[PDB]
Amino acid sequence: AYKMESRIKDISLAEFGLQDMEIAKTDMMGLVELQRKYRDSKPLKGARITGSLHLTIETSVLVETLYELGAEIRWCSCNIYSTQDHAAAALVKKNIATVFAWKNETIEDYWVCLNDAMTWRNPNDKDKICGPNLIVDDGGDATLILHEGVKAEIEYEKYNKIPEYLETELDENGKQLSMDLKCMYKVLKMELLKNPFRWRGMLKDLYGVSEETTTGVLRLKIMESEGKLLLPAINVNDSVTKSKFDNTYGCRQSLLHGLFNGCIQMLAGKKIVVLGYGEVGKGCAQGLSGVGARVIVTEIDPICALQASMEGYQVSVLEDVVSEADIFITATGNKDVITVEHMRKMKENAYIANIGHFDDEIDVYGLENYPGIKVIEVKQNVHKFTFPDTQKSVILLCKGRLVNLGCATGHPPLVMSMSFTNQVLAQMDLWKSRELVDRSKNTRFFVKKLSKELDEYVARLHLDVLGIKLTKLTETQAKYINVSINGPYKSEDYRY
Template identity: 55%
Template structure:
């Protein structure tokens, strides 16, 4: 969420030089990536529409103030399309043929099959023109054009430099602590896939607080006993969803 909140506009702005404020933006998916994307674009003044398959995520999007509907209902009204689902064929050739002239198409979710670029390449009567590196105008047989960023691949990497270093520091710290845990306590982990233990997750966060000037409140022994957690954590059950 926090990485894409930074790297999505970081890619759109230099790629297109388009003012995001006032634009109608469609975000496909409201998982962690979609939430960060929608928040970033809303912060730039866009009118954000979200699509979802999951009723819980759809409810979250609606409660966060976003219109939630299908792409088919709004495809001709949208200025910028952003896919963040991790699925395939989220934007089809049929969708792209229905887009307004010079609609911007961007993917931050998955490989280049999230947007059907292969289908677009096979479509008779199309012409692909490089505007600048990683920005292509596709002239469609409808007489309209769309702008596709990073060939339909991850545009926050193709049109920008990806997530900022602070976000990556959290990710890499996770990996290092996981490796240390496996080395020191390997006998506790038979072959399998594991979620990082909660106390290590909290340690990763603690290690990054000073850089942000964060000061934690400390539980008293009485308070810790009252809610049934150790004073120094972990503070949540393993299945807690932050």
């Protein structure tokens, strides 16, 4: 059953994925504990969960946890390069989930996989389609195809024809559409022809989405402020045990791993530009400095810029260092931070990489389609581009996709367990509150965060991994600082 419907690269890798999962679980104590405590009561029993999140070994442990808790699951990855084929195979082999994911997907396949992951067959038999009850999302793509799908269906009935914005390769402004929008639109058009009630029909059983990353949260907030959010949402990124660990310490290690795999050069002594000094940029700079690089930071936020200066880093505008720096790393979550014009001024064999969620940070399309550009494959997912007029070259890591997952295996299990423990608690919260979702009276939906009590609990579940011994307050001390002995220990606005 699961093996026939799933689409993965190679089931024979299952045994290696299972063995890696067991090793990873030594450190993923949060997920191990949730399984231990809830596998028998099954709090998610009956829930249909669709996930769009990098299908790595760490993610396979998250999926296993959701399955042990009672959920039926369909999964896909949220990046064309981030899937670990042995991880995917492990899930299918054990019948833990129906999977549509493989490393090195085409953009078209990415959107077909996501769409298939959102498709559930009616538990009341026959050719009837349903949607998921809950969504685990990373970057907002599952949430995007749902909202855009609803928008397309309304537009479709209004003029009783395929909306023309779906049949054009051009933007409202005039420029060409990203390959991602063209592929999503192609899937949506196809669905308008199969069943133009598919998307609105899913709303009936949709109880929520838990969003993993900064960029996904930004998308959610924009929908919320415009009154367009169609389901309840939990912002997992902003849990303290997520944003202050995964984003920073995870990147401190996995950026280095991606660079070491993709870039042959020594980092020590090099001028390395980290564009953006937020949670991710802070971790990146720390790792880079740790191996002797001279980090130069760019920022638009005066506070973050001052923080960088306090760690001994030069803070400059890209234009003043573009011809002198050796390596450029984008960590902004923004777009057009490195343009083709910037790339033409870089020194011979400068390296460029992106660690933000989307490739838009770097003008990869402009680079690849520059007239007379010459490209060679240096190794898998590493390309050297040579301009025709100057004959100078730049080297780009994995077509500007998130380098730690494209050119390496992503963050290690410990921090992913902290982020994923938050995901499981978020999913449990949304599922338990499903009766409060009434699609007739209650039309307006919101984004919330998990409580500080749960945030502290996530941390407690990982202390033993590191042999950390926590101090206990006496009654006198607890009263003196005005906190309960069991916490929470900090006010809501505390920044850690």
